[PDB]
Amino acid sequence: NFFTEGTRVWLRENGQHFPSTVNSCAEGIVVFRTDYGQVFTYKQSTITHQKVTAMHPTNEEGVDDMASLTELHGGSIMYNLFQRYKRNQIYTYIGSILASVNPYQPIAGLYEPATMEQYSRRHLGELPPHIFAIANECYRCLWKRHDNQCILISGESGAGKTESTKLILKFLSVISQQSLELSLKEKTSCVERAILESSPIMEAFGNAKTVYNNNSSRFGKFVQLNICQKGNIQGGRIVDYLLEKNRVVRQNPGERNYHIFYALLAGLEHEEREEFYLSTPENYHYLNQSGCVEDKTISDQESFREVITAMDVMQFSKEEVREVSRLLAGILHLGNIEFITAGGAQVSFKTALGRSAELLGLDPTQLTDALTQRSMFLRGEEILTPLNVQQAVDSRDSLAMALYACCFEWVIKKINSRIKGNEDFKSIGILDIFGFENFEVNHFEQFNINYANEKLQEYFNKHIFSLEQLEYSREGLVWEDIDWIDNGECLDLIEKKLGLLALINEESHFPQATDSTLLEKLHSQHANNHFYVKPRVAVNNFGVKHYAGEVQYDVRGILEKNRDTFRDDLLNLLRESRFDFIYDLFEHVSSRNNQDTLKCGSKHRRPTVSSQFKDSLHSLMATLSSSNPFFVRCIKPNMQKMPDQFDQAVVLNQLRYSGMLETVRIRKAGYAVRRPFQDFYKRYKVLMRNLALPEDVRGKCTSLLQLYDASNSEWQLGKTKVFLRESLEQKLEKRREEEVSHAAMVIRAHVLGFLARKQYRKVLYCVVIIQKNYRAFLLRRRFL
Amino acid sequence: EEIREAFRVFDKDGNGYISAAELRHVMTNLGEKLTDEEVDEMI
Amino acid sequence: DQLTEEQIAEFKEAFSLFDKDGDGTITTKELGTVMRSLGQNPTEAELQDMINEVDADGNGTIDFPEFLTMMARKMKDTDSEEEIREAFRVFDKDGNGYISAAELRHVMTNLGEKLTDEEVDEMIREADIDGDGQVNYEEFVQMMT
Ligand SMILES: Nc1ncnc2c1ncn2[C@@H]1O[C@H](COP(=O)(O)OP(=O)(O)O)[C@@H](O)[C@H]1O
Ligand code: VO4
Ligand SMILES: [Mg+2]
């Protein structure tokens, strides 16, 4: 295990393999210097084979596909990503899986339309790894495979999921046109232009600044693109998941509310600003509480311009844009209502109330009464009871959230209406969820976000490892099982009967229950569950050992957030609005009033945030389960939003918990492509033209595959199917394309020579009949 | 009648008019060259 | 090898038809059209390789002697009753001898060369089996002689 000075080695320093150089080897002491700047010293006698191993040649300036790596460990995988990151190569393959390291800066030429064109005309692996190559492969599968496709993008908050989604959408829009026919009038009226313009609208209404991302997605998005048999986008559908409606009324320190509020205030012209009684963001409780602020407007002004343009493309009328502006202004003024106690809650100053009532189309005394009093009718006279200041604040904030959430729902309806089209052939679905987030203080919002991330990780494992190896077993392939860290038990803790959501929902249905009684139940039931953490000192918290790390949740607020109560008094008030836009939003809205039995312990219970979210996720995963998936793994290089800063500890953590090592193992050894024997033979028959084939189909498949790999290692025959590596399938698809094209040339040349010969023989015949007739007609006329 | 068949296919016009000079360019270069003397009479 | 006087005369006929200019020169674009008119079915590629030889300068013209050479060259190949038949057979699938008008139209428009739809729809609607419901290739191959 002795290595001379200057030797490149992997030093196992119990946790990982470090890329290192032998600094010195004298007096029975060996000193190693890592590429990360660490110096490790040992007695030479203590060094054994791994402790130390030689580093393969150069590894090599990087490898494009990590299945090509010689040394397979976390250290090796990370070093490959690092070397590539250093030269602005942010993309690396693991078979057809894509790793993307956020550069946090523009990389010249990387996403230009000239690059998109280049990727559209090549096969996977012919050019450097790129998100465009994945989008292209996915698109090509609509004619190579019999099913719908989906692209699932994973990663922590700020990893690059949203940017990845926009790049895939841009690429597919471009490829859709290709598939004919152009005109700038077409291209500006375009369904693909409308699909692209959905992003600035949705980001303004659904994204906000958080500690991990200045443009954090505060809702989940599933974009389905319907593609016709001819290859063009017919239309689409966008599905939104759990918008963080509480952000409207409160934010953690240093965060911002939704971008749209700041864009509105920065972007509106003086006249409209004055019409809606709007001033700077500092003047609004719903925008000033976080202390951020910290910006001299300008970026918000550009976002407003971008939104306005997108809304015009989306066919929002100028009045609809003004109506949305009026509602947002109404919400802002609503937040400035202050209360005092004078038996009991009373509105202190009339200005904010008057402005909000005017903008919302409500009578100011009716609004004051609804926020400060509760109504009851008894056989059959009204009994008005005062609310206290906390109840009045909760009413004001519930009203602000209801308005925003309904407006967001309407905006999504409008986008969907614009992009509506036929579903005649197949679809490509793209999933952009809110990423994993672990804040200093986590509340119910983080619990739901992290649950969705956990659910997606389970789908990734089910498809990459579980179902994959089960198929190899059923087909009887020569296969050594690859182990992988399964998060199924964490989802069981969250989802099962008596699980976290079950207990949260059960406590929510009991009016007497508090967050403290809930925590007692959570601790009692799950203290011994491997994935649950009962804190030793933190009396208000419970922890969950998520795939991406242990997260501690403060219970304070869970019941009220899960119940998501909205007073019938407020719903009735909104239906009084003289502003049709507001009335239309609340016209048929279902009641969410606080229930008080009697003896209504009946199995149904009112739907909670948790129950509605669990259902939506389940519905989504069921849709995804029937599509063929492509996986993109986004990696955050650092926690400072910095370019050219690869934090090896930060990166290694993500590679470890996401199971990148095991993923590389199964994509290197496995056979991701498979077709029944006859299907394989019928597809690749063109490639067997020059072969002496046996009578049996298994033999026919073997004949072709043996030419590509005589070792029988890149392909295998199962019970019913031909199994082959993605690289071999790509090699076969490239050759099939070349022969098919050559055959089209042979027939294109033969038919053109038929058409021209037909008409040349026709003209030669038509003339000889007129020449013979004229030779006769003139011979008679000569005789007269 | 055995003429209208060979003149309905002798034009790209598709309006019953076989652009004069083109008919002259058809004869002499053809399968049965007409010494242009016959061509001077078909004007 | 050698071209009989009757053969040379038959070619000068087809040449002179496209030589409207009366200068003894046809355009490069017309070389395809003329060769095709006389039997020979060169590929877009074969045609380019012929042009690059004759017309290096970029004049865009072909005299009768250089055309005659292109003809006698393509005449040497010879391929083949089962060669067009083999190219059509890649467009299957089930060995029934049937290719649909849809993919055949795709071959004619996108692939090979981009050509006029009004001429290719007549090349299908008239030159097709079952009258409407799809085309037989082995029959079409036989008809293409
Ligand atoms: N491909 C990329 N190239 C350059 N900057 C990027 C890229 N991906 C992400 N970023 C930057 O990092 C931010 C976080 O990425 P984003 O997609 O918004 O996060 P998320 O994974 O949370 O959806 C971006 O808004 C952008 O500023
Ligand atoms: O920052 V995120 O879009 O992952 O929530
Ligand atoms: Mg995002």
Author numbering:
A (entry chain A): 3 to 786
B (entry chain G): 83 to 125
C (entry chain C): 2 to 146
Original paper wording:
We thus crystallized the motor domain of myosin X in the pre-powerstroke state (with ADP vanadate bound) at 1.8 Å resolution, as well as that of the MD2IQ of myosin X at 3.1 Å resolution. The PPS structure differs in the orientation and position of the converter as compared with other plus-end myosins. Comparison of these PPS structures show that while the subdomains of the motor are totally conserved in position among the myosin PPS structures obtained to date, the myosin X converter is rotated compared with that of myosin Vc and other myosins. This is not due to a conformational change within the converter as found in myosin VI27. Instead, a sharper turn at the end of the SH1 helix, (at Gly672), allows formation of specific interactions between the converter and the Nter subdomain in particular with class-specific loops of this subdomain. Our MD2IQ pre-powerstoke structure indicates this could occur without steric hindrance between the CaM and the rest of the motor.
